[PDB]
Design a protein around this nucleic acid. Structure first.
Lengths: 135, 99, 62, 189, 138
RNA sequence: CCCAUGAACGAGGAAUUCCCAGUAAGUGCGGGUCAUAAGCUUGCGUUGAUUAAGUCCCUGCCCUUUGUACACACCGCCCGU
């Protein structure tokens, strides 16, 4: 059902924000991470190719995630923000900041913020050539 | 003509330096020739720091920092305006900008 | 949504392809003033009153 | 018989404040007994707003090519059938001025976006001067381009706009258009 | 000697011979709010409601009012009455009372002493008017 | 000058020109041409605004640095069946 204890005490989930440069994920799971509460992406909120990673779509996804979590009994979130990682870009996309702000402004409490992009000790070859992509 | 005395790299006293991939185009550029930036920014931007701080469960959580290392090839470093072309005399100046 | 009075200290200027938006810096009068920069448009009187009907909209540059 | 002017009073007419002169400010040389002054409001910026929103509303209704600038019509609007109803009302005459905009007044708009795309609009808001400038420029323009051949035509074009012009309500219609688009722009946060 | 500048504005003029006489209330010799164009007829009623009937028992202002243009001929009567009161009070008792009624009248409205300097500007080359140009083909 | 037999009678293909206040536009009047000769031009008044107090996106100009195999100067030079 729901956690019905200590109405004056927070309930903590984990939000896995995958802010790629193509779209963004707002993914709230159980504290362990094994069981997921709700996953809303930028592509299910706006319908066009570029705006999938827009800050607007990210904040809409974060608002929907916060609404669903509040209806499900979760009140606070730990933030585990990631980029694409691997050998590709290590910086988070445009939707990270707006998703985090829309979580912090939609009635949610924020716990620990940490960065979890996958960083190789050394990677395989990148998708480009030795001359890179020339567009 | 010989434009730069160091040939636009930092290879002195060795034959081969391992290459790296430009963060923008994924071009193979020698590690000494590549233009390296190290951005230590805030995970949460200034326009979003205040809202995160109000929503924080812990008082004075001190927000985490994002450490990103960027390697640029010459073309992508010039296009992104990280470095510009300088005069024949200003080219020899190796002082970093004050920032 | 409380409207807060803001006094303009410096006009950052116009933004756009042909120039269609404005940016300024504003501070409070006697309300623990902070040098907060927000987008304005056109007329700004000498010590005008920007309407911070929201404290979380710091219009972002670049 | 110690009352000031011909319509105001000072003995028991209390507004409990002085901070209610955002658009209307008549305390200096800019006073003329009737709003008939001809004159210019394009000599330098901010001057269209310094035209008080009463005079702005009644006198910036000069658009299109048939009644473009001719001040006899503003004279008709504000002079005939308003000073009479100011006392023919019987009630407190402040209602007409204070039943217009304090909830109507647009408090945000937006600006074009990027190099490719028009599906959103970067949020901007102003101090009252440019918000009045832009919002009621577009209001007057839309009202004249669409309301050409108006059933609400002059010799009775004082009541509706003088009740939905200055302050005190949320009932104006082009204002509702700009307020809904204001919320659309407000969504940029 | 004789100090007489009367009233004028833009184009029109109200020659105001100020002297002692009947000095009845008349504009163009005609009643209070009775002017035929009927547009700006209140501008003179305002002051005479403050002082009283005794004050205008000896101020004859004989006005030759000529000139077409409302914003000229009107707004020149206010200038003329301002100068009439100014001269009368300056010459008769003292300039403190003239100071006072001139203060109320001029701080009441700026535009008596100041006229519009705007006038039609010259036509130029290769255009239908001052700024417009003829259509340029390619 | 006029008799009412209706003019798609109330915002306009890609392509574009001009314009920031007594300005645009409407409106007529003089001068030149000339016999009163004007739908031209050159001036003059009269009614009289909407927008903007910005930018370098387009078209171009200027002051610097930079590259050039161009100097007939990029409508250049030049490569291969």
């Amino acid at each position: 059902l729901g956690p019905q204890v200590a109405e004056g005490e927070n309930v903590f989930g984990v939000c896995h924000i995958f802010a790629s440069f193509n779209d963004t994920f707002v993914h709230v799971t159980d504290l362990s991470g094994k069981e997921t509460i709700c996953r809303v992406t930028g592509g299910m909120k706006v319908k066009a190719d570029r705006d999938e990673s827009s800050p607007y779509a990210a904040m809409l996804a974060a608002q929907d995630v916060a609404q669903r979590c509040k209806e499900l009994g979760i009140t606070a979130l730990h933030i585990k923000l990631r980029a694409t990682g691997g050998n590709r870009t290590k910086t988070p996309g445009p939707g990270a900041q707006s998703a985090l702000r829309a979580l912090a402004r939609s009635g949610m409490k924020i716990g620990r913020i940490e960065d979890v992009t996958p960083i190789p000790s050394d990677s395989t070859r990148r998708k480009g050539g030795r001359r890179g992509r020339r567009l | 003509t010989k434009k730069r005395r160091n040939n636009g790299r930092a290879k002195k006293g060795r034959g081969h330096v391992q290459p790296i991939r430009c963060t923008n185009c994924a071009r193979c550029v020698p590690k000494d020739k590549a233009i390296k930036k190290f951005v230590i920014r805030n995970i949460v931007e200034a326009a979003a720091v205040r809202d995160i701080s109000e929503a924080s469960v812990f008082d004075a959580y001190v927000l985490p920092k994002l450490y990103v290392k960027l390697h640029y090839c010459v073309s992508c470093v010039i296009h992104s305006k990280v470095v510009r072309n300088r005069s024949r005399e200003a080219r020899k100046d190796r002082t970093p900008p004050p920032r | 949504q409380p409207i807060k009075l803001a006094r303009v200290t410096k006009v950052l200027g116009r933004t756009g392809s042909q120039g269609q938006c404005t940016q300024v810096r504003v501070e409070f009068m006697d309300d623990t003033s902070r040098s907060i920069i927000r987008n304005v448009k056109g007329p700004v009187r000498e010590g005008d009153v920007l309407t911070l009907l929201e404290s979380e909209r710091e219009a972002r540059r670049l | 018989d110690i009352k000031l002017f011909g319509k105001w009073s000072t003995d028991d007419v209390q507004i409990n404040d002085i901070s209610l002169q955002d658009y209307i400010a008549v305390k200096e040389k800019y006073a003329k007994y009737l709003p008939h002054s001809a004159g210019r409001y394009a000599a330098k910026r901010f001057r269209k707003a310094q035209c008080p929103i009463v005079e702005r509303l009644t006198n910036s209704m000069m658009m299109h090519g048939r009644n473009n600038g001719k001040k006899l019509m503003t004279v008709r609007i504000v002079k005939h059938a308003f000073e009479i109803i100011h006392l023919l009302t019987g009630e407190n005459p402040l209602q007409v001025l204070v039943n217009a905009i304090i909830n109507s007044g647009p408090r945000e708009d937006s600006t074009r976006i990027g190099r490719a795309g028009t599906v959103r609009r970067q949020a901007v808001d102003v101090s009252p001067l440019r918000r009045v400038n832009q919002a009621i420029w577009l209001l007057c323009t839309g009202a004249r381009e669409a309301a050409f051949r108006n059933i609400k035509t002059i010799a009775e074009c004082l009541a509706d706009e003088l009740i939905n012009a200055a302050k005190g309500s949320s009932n104006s219609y082009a204002i509702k258009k700009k307020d809904e688009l204001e919320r659309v722009a407000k969504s940029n946060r | 000697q004789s100090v007489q500048v009367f009233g004028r504005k833009k184009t029109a003029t109200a020659v105001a011979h100020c002297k002692r006489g009947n000095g009845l209330i008349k504009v163009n010799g005609r009643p209070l709010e009775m002017i035929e164009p009927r547009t700006l007829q209140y501008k003179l009623l305002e002051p005479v409601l403050l002082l009283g009937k005794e004050r205008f028992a000896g101020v004859d202002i004989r006005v030759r009012v000529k000139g077409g243009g409302h914003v000229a001929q009107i707004y020149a009567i206010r200038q003329s009455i301002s100068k009439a009161l100014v001269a009368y009070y300056q010459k008769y008792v003292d300039e403190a009372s003239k100071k006072e009624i001139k203060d109320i009248l001029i701080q009441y409205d700026r535009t008596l002493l100041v006229a519009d300097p705007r006038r039609c500007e010259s036509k130029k080359f290769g255009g239908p008017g001052a700024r417009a140009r003829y259509q340029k083909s390619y």
